[PDB]
């Protein structure tokens, strides 16, 4: 676990070494969720000082997307090629989180790509990195994702989790109630039919016996 190693090695470091470590973490391949590194008091102390830009960049990588780094580019320090590619991958993940059939136009507008070959190469890179799984449909100009990882969450996002899980539980409860009611109704119908048939047969037998006297 690369993030565990970076947390362990950043126990007491602060200042320029902290910024170098943040740059290394952002550029390090394979690590795509920075939530353990963000919660450190040592990291959070960067707000007061001349290194607030690095903390803002870390927040952008953890929660933001690439378009956020189109209007807030002057403030943050310059990004290398690996950092920009990682930000594009995370933007693809963010897009796939909310919709499971991403049009090519949305990706071209978000990731700032010129032609379709570059965009498809980036999507293939993301698939190989195994952060998303999916297929590319060129005829319909779509990317159909079957599975994407979950990114970092703030303290104001757990409410959505509890709301969705509550809705799912209510749906399951309603399904169970409906199944039980239908089972009861079917059993009642069968019993009523059998009872009616037996009464008809008893009446027929009584009438037949009476006529034989």
């Amino acid at each position: 676990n690369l993030l565990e190693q970076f947390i362990l090695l950043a126990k007491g470091t602060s200042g320029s070494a902290l910024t170098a470590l943040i740059s290394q973490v952002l550029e390090a391949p394979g690590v795509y969720v920075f939530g353990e590194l963000l919660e450190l008091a040592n990291v959070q102390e960067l707000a007061e000082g001349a290194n607030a830009a690095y903390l803002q960049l870390l927040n952008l990588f953890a929660y933001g997307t690439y378009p956020d780094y189109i209007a807030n580019k002057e403030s943050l320090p310059e990004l290398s090629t690996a950092q920009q590619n990682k930000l594009k991958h995370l933007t693809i993940v963010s897009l796939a989180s909310r919709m499971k059939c991403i049009p090519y136009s949305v990706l071209l507008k978000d990731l700032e790509m010129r032609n379709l070959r570059e965009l498809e190469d980036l999507i293939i890179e993301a698939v190989y990195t195994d952060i998303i799984q999916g297929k590319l449909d060129q005829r319909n100009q779509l990317l159909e994702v079957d599975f994407c990882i979950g990114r970092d969450i703030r303290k104001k996002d757990i409410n959505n989790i509890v709301k969705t899980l509550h809705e799912w539980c209510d749906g399951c409860e309603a399904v169970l109630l409906g199944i039980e009611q239908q089972v009861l109704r079917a059993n009642q119908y069968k019993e009523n039919h059998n009872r009616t048939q037996q009464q008809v047969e008893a009446e027929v037998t009584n009438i037949k016996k009476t006529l034989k006297a």
Partner: protein, 173 residues
């Protein structure tokens, strides 16, 4: 909904009647409301069964039947010409004015669903608006009105589980 209730009340009032014959105002309201709801058969039979004395006494029934006859032949210019030729005092005015809007919507839907290229003059005649008004009206709809040739191109416009359980319980007895 406000017209169907009035139609039902008029029908019941005519049916009860002081001896079969109803008053001319309810006759005119019934005829116009039959024209509204596209009940051409019912309107024709109502005109057939209206007493000739009432037709002679009240001359508005003639105009209402003229409008109905233009509707019966599907003559949209005739419908629009004959609608704006008579009036009453708040008895047929709302229904005769909703007739125009109903005919407008009907003609617009027919043009949309039955044509792929219709001349501007024919479209204006079907709707009743002037030609320039007819062309300029279809702007948000995007009907691709042409110039020179003046061609308008119309644009083409739970309980399930209980039901299944009932079906099975029927089949299996």
């Amino acid at each position: 909904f406000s017209f169907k209730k009035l139609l039902d009340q008029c029908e019941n009032q005519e049916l009860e009647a002081p001896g079969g014959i109803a008053t001319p105002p309810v006759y005119g309201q019934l005829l116009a409301l039959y024209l509204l709801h596209n009940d051409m058969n019912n309107a024709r039979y109502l005109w057939k069964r209206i007493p000739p004395a009432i037709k002679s006494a009240n001359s508005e029934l003639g105009g209402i039947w003229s409008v109905g006859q233009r509707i019966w032949q599907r003559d949209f210019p005739g419908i629009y010409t004959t609608i704006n030729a008579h009036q009453w005092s708040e008895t047929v005015q709302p229904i005769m004015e909703a007739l125009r809007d109903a005919t407008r919507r009907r003609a617009f839907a027919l043009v949309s669903q039955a044509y792929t290229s219709i001349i501007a003059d024919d479209f204006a005649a079907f709707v009743g608006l002037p030609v320039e008004e007819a062309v300029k009206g279809i702007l948000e709809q995007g009907w691709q009105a042409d110039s020179t040739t003046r061609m308008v191109l119309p644009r083409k416009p739970e309980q399930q589980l209980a039901r299944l359980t009932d079906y099975v319980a029927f089949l299996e007895n």
